[PDB]
């Protein structure tokens, strides 16, 4: 409101998805996401560890999008 509501565009609930740990290896995963719309960053919590993705960096975008798009 405005930034606050922008941050709420990404769900806060658990996401059940699939993650490719290598080029040819995939496994089920449950994750949480946080979004900071001021600078365009998403933080993902996976196996108790933090991962960050810069939404202005094409390589991060290509890594994050398959995780979101395979979620149920």
């Amino acid at each position: 409101a405005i930034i606050r509501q922008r941050n709420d565009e990404i769900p806060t609930r658990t996401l059940d998805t699939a993650i490719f740990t290598d080029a040819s290896t995939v496994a089920s995963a449950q994750i949480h996401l946080y979004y900071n719309s001021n600078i365009g960053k998403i933080i993902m919590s996976l196996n108790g560890k933090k991962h960050t993705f810069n939404l202005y960096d094409d390589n991060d975008i290509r890594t994050l999008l398959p995780i979101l798009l395979l979620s149920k």
Binding site: I10, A18, I19, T21, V26, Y35, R62, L65, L69
Partner: protein
């Protein structure tokens, strides 16, 4: 405008070209690009097409469809 960085990703969607997992629907690319694993390698998976359909069925799924849940 002050942009919402998510907006330019809302039409993104996955597709299998043989065993290669690709990302369609990104406006600034004039060509499709490969999806990357968590260790930064292009995803190549023998059961690619069956994995996609296991998740969504036959219905196509964009990022916008994910965000409206």
């Amino acid at each position: 405008k002050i942009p919402d960085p998510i907006d330019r990703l809302r039409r993104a969607n996955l597709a299998c070209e043989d065993d290669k997992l690709m990302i369609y629907g990104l406006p600034w690319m004039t060509t499709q690009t490969s999806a990357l694993s968590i260790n930064s390698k292009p995803i190549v998976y023998k059961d690619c097409a069956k994995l996609l359909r296991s998740i969504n069925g036959s219905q196509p799924v964009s990022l916008n469809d994910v965000l409206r849940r």
